[PDB]
Design a protein around this ligand. Structure first.
Ligand SMILES: [Cu+]
Lengths: 72, 71
């Protein structure tokens, strides 16, 4: 039950782009604790007890381009 | 038997529409044509696959789907 911190570089070009990604991840609450998105930096930060590959696949299935991901 | 489905999807930029297009292209060639209009907020899908399967693929983008119908 450790909360891990994953960070993704995701191509998002409007508030709708970011809102869509936030929607799909927020649906995983309470297993997702917090989502931060920065349009400036094209970053998605996910704080969660879920595995990295699970989170990555939920983002990829949005159709948004994921340029990188990592665990912090 | 090729069905024509049409969805009203809230899409605000080419990144929104490109995402919808991307999830649909993963189903080629069973999805044989995809036409998306930002101006009209419309996604037209021509496919042999079931309506609900297509709808669920589109709902996974996280975009709002206002309605869908088979033409
Ligand atoms: Cu967008």
């Amino acid at each position: 039950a450790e909360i891990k911190h994953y960070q993704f570089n995701v191509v998002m070009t409007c508030s709708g782009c970011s809102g869509a990604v936030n929607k799909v991840l927020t649906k995983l609450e309470p297993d997702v604790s917090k989502i931060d998105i920065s349009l400036e930096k094209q970053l998605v930060d996910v704080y969660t007890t879920l595995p990295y590959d699970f989170i990555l696949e939920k983002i990829k299935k949005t159709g948004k381009e994921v340029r990188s991901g990592k665990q912090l």
